[model samples]
Target: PRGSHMIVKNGEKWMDRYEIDSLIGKGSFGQVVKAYDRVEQEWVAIKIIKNKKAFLNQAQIEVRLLELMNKHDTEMKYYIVHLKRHFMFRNHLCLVFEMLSYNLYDLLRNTNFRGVSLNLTRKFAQQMCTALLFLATPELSIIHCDLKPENILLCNPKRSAIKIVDFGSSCQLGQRIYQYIQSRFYRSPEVLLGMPYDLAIDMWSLGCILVEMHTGEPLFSGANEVDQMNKIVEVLGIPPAHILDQAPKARKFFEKLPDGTWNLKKTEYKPPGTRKLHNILGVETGGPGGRRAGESGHTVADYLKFKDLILRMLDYDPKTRIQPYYALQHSFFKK
Candidate 1:
């Protein structure tokens, strides 16, 4: 607990309340361990942040953001993960959360990435949209800067239920702190273009996530930022000139012609619009990845509605991108 790596003892007691049971996971900033909460008489997840200045400040943001959301979600009806409490132990910042099950990436792996049913995808979409709707409230107005499959966890492995976790890079609208945020696969066009972003970026992530859930693979698997854009453009086509015209970082990915037209820079990946969304998604009863179980909703009509919802969510202009309120009201969620 004295360095970047926190050496946790198997049976160590934290604050005389939480007893370490086993290692749950590990990451650059810290490790999470399964712990027994003596006071609550329940299992918990304890995030042991490294005892370093850089990581300390990072974890502080997580603590404050969690508090802001938790303070507003008194009933815990929202799907956002709850932070039970926090304290310092041997110079490490220890954060406690209620025990949760497998993350979505692991869920994908359990199925060999063949994908889940449309029925199950809709079940998740509604809940996530509701949570985002709650986050967009006048009281909260939070932007989850990083929203990805690995950050979403199921409350139970067998259940379709889930909760959003890890707000380490989160910020409210006015607080827009990071130039770089979000994983590559789910990064929004606005953020990718280095333009100031808002809650809509999360909507972009939600769209990518929903598609991946049904497709059994990442929608855009780029090796780096440039590769990522090429992958996105290959399917979504180039960013609208209106958006490119205002983006300072657009020059990196596009070139302005003498005729005042802008085009994506050449890349090793297929040309822009080469990979059509319909082709990528199959857009009908049978699409990317093979069917598993309970995929009754995978019809042409259903695909069109789902595609429309994702297209709206992935709008290049954040100003026009679908909001959570309207997204929940979409035809995809009606049935």
Candidate 2:
């Protein structure tokens, strides 16, 4: 059964070690399954990575990170347990993880609960920040590029302890190929501008998720990628004129006319009808050219506290952004 073309038949077994119980989830990279470990007499979650996409290099990255976690003296024990790994069907890296009941997304969507309490949110945020803090070291600088609700797991629902899972897209900055790892809704503005960014991108995603946890809706859910950029500008205001001014390629995307010339071969990026700024801290826009919903209530200063922290994580100029250590010390996170 150890061959390149080995396939998983409906009930056919593999390696004579893991008993395939059921398929739990599937994504672009792999399939997750509930398997019974006969040798250990235990049940575990096995993520079967596809052979085509799961090349040797990626396998090494996965194994190396696991090894680091094993050796590093950190508080990952309370979070996730990367139990073991095995070559299944000869080619696939069947990664074994501790079994948990439900993810945060499932909990929020399934349960009739309007939303988790603010105290619970704060606690989870702190725990997440702690984890991020440990991973923020220069040697590591692990960016959990994907930080949506589905990736957050509730280890003990009653106790409210949660774990940020899914390192498939996670990596040390500048370690791998150019892969856009974040989901659209949580993607930061700098990411939209094709700027080479860093750990701050993860922080940006975290802010969106935190706000969504509070409002029970996405902070800026754009219809498409272009629209997503527009939404970001609406909330954060446009990128500094200098940023666009310095980068010709970037300017091409946002500039409407080249010197306002009468005879123009190509027109630059035009502001879409839906591109006007919307105040995320206070009011909702009715349309492209609409007034704030109700009276404009919240001030930039009120939102700036949270926005500042998020902006630090979302800085277009990565060099100027707040480092992970400094951000953890911000008042928004201070108890």
Candidate 3:
């Protein structure tokens, strides 16, 4: 019963441990409030999920997953968001987490959405890979179905440290809890095509994030799910028949021609160029421009390495997509 009364007003004490400050965020499922832990003597963020059965069940799963990851943090140092505790308040389930600064989306906004420096992008990419690799471990084996800029928070105002947050859409490996997962812009081809997916989906999203950090815009921004697939295809070109064959919904956007070629249904939405990422990213063939590789004074060789990495991450076939462990060892990261 979402009565007229507020759940936790300012200055209210929760569980006789946390002092509520103010509402920091709200969504369809719940709200997050900034609070002070009296016992721990530290600031924290408390997520209060709706009292509905579905929401509560999801919250329980999120709390459990976070707990599993938290237990191994000391050994792995994965930079995952820490969940301190959880409790029931009235009919809602409240989760307490360590307070953190703005997310990557906020940083992009601060830059006027013009993109960040390549060095900064590289640093963040490496950190993200480290986090993903930890999640990919056989012991941990988790799939972060949702990985976007908003889910990644800066540990401090200096923007030197970051942590992956939000496990509402996460699940253990091989679990098909939700057929549809991941935010639109960051979603992968396998997910869009209704193909069985795994952790490779995160790699695809990470590739989009890396490009967004460098380009100040989503690498694949579509109007809707259909348009989203179009945007991806526009850049990557049509996926191989073998890959498409596995996707149950592939026929929605593609049709087999009499000659055996797969023709796009929305032919009007042609890509700007040949669908090469290098051209889409504005990396010149010969040399220099901005902080991106192949910009003024930088060699084309540097751009090729970065381009190769992105291509692998954006591979249409999930099996061929670069794994987090291998991505960490790529030449781009080595440099």
Candidate 4:
């Protein structure tokens, strides 16, 4: 029903509630239509997901997740609203969500890397971390397997806050074992290496997003998995032993000597020795597109400091990385 196109005349209603208006977007699974509710008299975005592939199971899971999310009310406070649900043509599931101003993807494309203000980014980052931290509890941890700017939405015109969306790939903590979550550009090293992971994976994606919001570009925009790992090393320096121990599959990327441990020296693909922190900080001699005049001011440094915190939260080793609570306590959020 939802998978198939439908034409509704003026004053037509769905299930005797939502009033369809105009089409917003269409994706592989379904389409989003801008609509108005006769009863509430408010505009809403309706996402009609098709059961074309006979994915009743997935549809059910989505329903359950939305139900749980609404029950707690945490989802609504963050504007992760699930206004209503119904079946279309007795087959497809139709979900109604609160309408928002704009998606983060459109903002990124339009801004051309100029980026949002420092305080605004910090506030949104803090809110997201707070939401994730609440979800990360042992009983109800939510692993947002796909965390990118495009998946985040703006709640206001000022770009003050963001709402995390696109839960089609999400999973309960430790629910599915060894399932790969792909979003190569925002993915962590362990994810690319096919290693088992948990909520920490989402944290890594969050870290990537925070940095991109400031720089107006990807933090570790790699050509491939290998290149990604190399870029990470370039920014944070070589991986420590503990992080390596946590990711066994990543060993394939390294070559070793006869010693009991892998020798970092044996690798032929050496990244530029300088770290990105140094480059961004303008600590060294000039290069093409180095920090510009007045770039060393307090505001720029503050942004870089927050960027560093994001990177730390995304540390390759989940255990050592800064967890959400600790991240909230960072001086970057002091203001």
Candidate 5:
């Protein structure tokens, strides 16, 4: 049943209301299509899940989580895509969501990956912070396992506002439903280390996405799981001794050293200090050549403030990583 499309026919009416017009995208689990809502006089995204029972069970979780998130988010302050409705069709589950504009990836592509301005990054981060904070609340406890450029959608292209979508891979805290989660680039240190993870993982992915938002490239792009860990170390250096020693999966890529130190099994990537965050950010050098947001109403202090917040968000220890509450209070948002 893997990779099987749901056999959708054009001009076919779903729920006798939504007319399936075109396929927007497809995934291993299912596919999303743009349907003309006859009643609403608008287009919407309909996620048609595979008929496989396992996928159905997963889709149910998404429905429940969206309901939980939507119920508490009646004010719409939370930057999460709204689920319009759902139904069963052709032995499959179909969910309807509000049609949103191009995803952040498309935005990056349009910008030629030069990255957006810092001020715009702040605007985007503010909305995402609100979303993360909402998910962190006790009633929610939602952990968006997938928080990458493609999963984030813009409410309106003209405005800097955005919303995070695709909670299909999400789960609640304390519910370790999936072992392998989050995309490679956005995967957190804990997730990579075979350690129990929680709400903090979303912040980790957010940290990575935030850097990618303005920098026009993924902070850590890895070809696989091992490469991901290496890419992280390439940027942020080795994991703390306690973390390295404790991580169940550490032995795969690291050689334990005497005196609480560890060495990479393979050092093909640049050494740790070779990829300092400051220089990569080009905060002082005004690098990246184009999309030079450095001079666009941003100062050295501003960039440093941002880097500090990034460091906090990207803390190796999930225990102390920037929580949404304190993240919102970070000085980067203040100025």
Candidate 6:
């Protein structure tokens, strides 16, 4: 059976359980609604997937991943969202979640697109690391193929607790089901290069996200895959020959020089001017009251410490990128 329409309006009830209050959000896969649970007498977020078979199948995978993540120990569970339950309504697959407040993306927008203070950034980054560390463990290692501000929601208006949400793109390690995973700006080099990736890809995304939080802008905002690769190389420099060779589409971007060196195939491609992380961080100048870079009162040492961790996380080789556990131990978080 197929749903006649994807939209679920206010006051609608599904399965005599959840009474829809308002539409919270919508996406290509489905729509999320703020609904009241009559059985529990609490507000819950319900994700209703379109009735198409493909969308239904994807929702099933997302539900399973959420359940597996929920099985983690109580301490680790705080950083991840909990799946309340799931059912079918109006021929659409519906998933229920506890109500949450605005996401990190909302915070970013409310702050006028300026990066948060270093202290706040450190807190958020550590929380994200804690969440990712749990996912990286051998027993429950799950790759959150998509990690971004929009996917991180605040537990309440106080913004004291952050929870990672959206498992629709998640998969277990060594069980890759999709060649393309992750959003454009936070996408890692290995993923962009078309190479096989794993949990390390999440680390790469976290690196970009932390920087965006500090600077109030995406570190890599490429218009497309090719442009995305260009944005990455612009900061990280061209991938080493061995690394580039691993990608099936390597030749599309790179060409061998007469002397065994590699050059970008695009003639208009210019060498990146700001190749250093410190330089990029220094140039960002947005915050409350038009605060200038360095006006936050953080010392140069603070910036350097943060830069060091980001560099390791953004390593060109996925084999060598910093793991979430090690990143949590980094000196940037210590202070």
List TM-scores for all candidates, in order. 0.95, 0.76, 0.93, 0.82, 0.95, 0.93
Per-residue error at 258 for model 2, in Å? 7.6
Clashes of each: 0, 0, 4, 0, 0, 0
- Over the stretch 138-224, how does candidate 2's per-residue lDDT look in tens digits? 666677677888888887666677876677676777874544558999886566665665777777787777666644566678787
lDDT of 6 by residue, 1-335 (tens): 34534666688777787787888887787888998899999999988887778888878889998988887766677899989889877788888999999987788898888777878888888999999888987877799999998999989877658999888888888888887889999988877778888899988999999888877888888888888888787887778888866678787678778878777778545485356676677734333234554565466777778889989988988888899878888998874
Clashes of 4: 0
- Candidate 2 deviant stretches above 4 angstroms: 1-16, 53-57, 76-83, 111-114, 245-252, 256-308, 311-314
Q: Considering every candidate listed, which one attains the maximal lDDT?
A: 5
Steric clash pairs (candidate 2)? none
Q: Look at candidate 6 and give me any clashing residue pairs.
A: none
Which residue pairs of candidate 5 clash?
A: none
Predictions: Cα RMSD each = 1.8, 5.9, 2.4, 3.9, 1.9, 2.3
**Clashes (candidate 5):** 0
Quick one: ranking by lDDT, best first?
Answer: 5, 1, 3, 6, 4, 2
After TM-score superposition, what is the CA distance of residue 122 in candidate 6 from its true location, in Å?
Answer: 0.4
Where is model 5 poorest over a 10-residue stretch in terms of lDDT? 287-296
What root-mean-square deviation over C-alphas does model 1 reach?
1.8
* lDDT comparison, 2 vs 5, better candidate: 5
